[PDB]
């Protein structure tokens, strides 16, 4: 959920609620356990609030309307500062990066995807070293992605 129907899909002043309220009501009952989710929930604070979709949602929070969001910690901070309300509905769930060894475990799970994606074999030691490499040389990136970048980049390198 969001950005497309909630923003691109708007020409009129009530378009923050048209379609949006519609779908909120469409999903309240009968049609299995519908859960919407927001990948870029930062928008849902509103630019100056003004109920830019953001208030109608929590306004209806007494039931159903199950939604999971996602924000970075600083975006969280910003939507909190810029709203004060969605936070009463939303549970803050902290996500920590994995250790290097744990990162390798995901790399292993992902390894065959990459071998397939690029048509190349990958060594287990590739994954192991990618993760420790990243810890050492990529301070501005988190391990999951950093290690994967080393893998997917290397694979792409070879693919070319």
């Amino acid at each position: 959920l969001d950005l497309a129907a909630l923003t691109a899909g708007a020409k009129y002043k009530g378009d923050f609620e048209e379609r949006f309220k519609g779908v909120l009501k469409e999903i309240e009952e009968s049609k299995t356990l519908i859960v919407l989710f927001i990948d870029e929930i930062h928008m849902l604070m509103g630019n100056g609030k003004d109920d830019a979709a953001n208030i109608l949602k929590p306004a209806l929070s007494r039931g159903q309307l199950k939604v999971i969001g996602a924000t970075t910690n600083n975006e969280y901070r910003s939507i909190v500062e810029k709203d004060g309300a969605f936070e009463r509905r939303f549970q803050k769930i902290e996500v920590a990066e994995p250790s290097v060894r744990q990162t390798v475990a995901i790399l292993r799970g992902l390894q065959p995807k990459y071998e397939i994606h690029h048509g190349v074999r990958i060594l287990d030691s590739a994954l192991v070293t990618a993760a420790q490499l990243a810890k050492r040389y990529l301070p501005y990136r988190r391990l999951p992605d950093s290690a994967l970048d080393l893998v997917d980049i290397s694979c792409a390198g070879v693919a070319v």
Partner: peptide, 20 residues
């Protein structure tokens, strides 16, 4: 101070505790 430019606020310490 809210209202001043730079909405990255106490990032280094407070926000870390806010988050953690």
């Amino acid at each position: 101070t809210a209202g001043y430019v730079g909405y990255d606020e106490g990032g280094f310490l407070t926000n870390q505790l806010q988050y953690k």
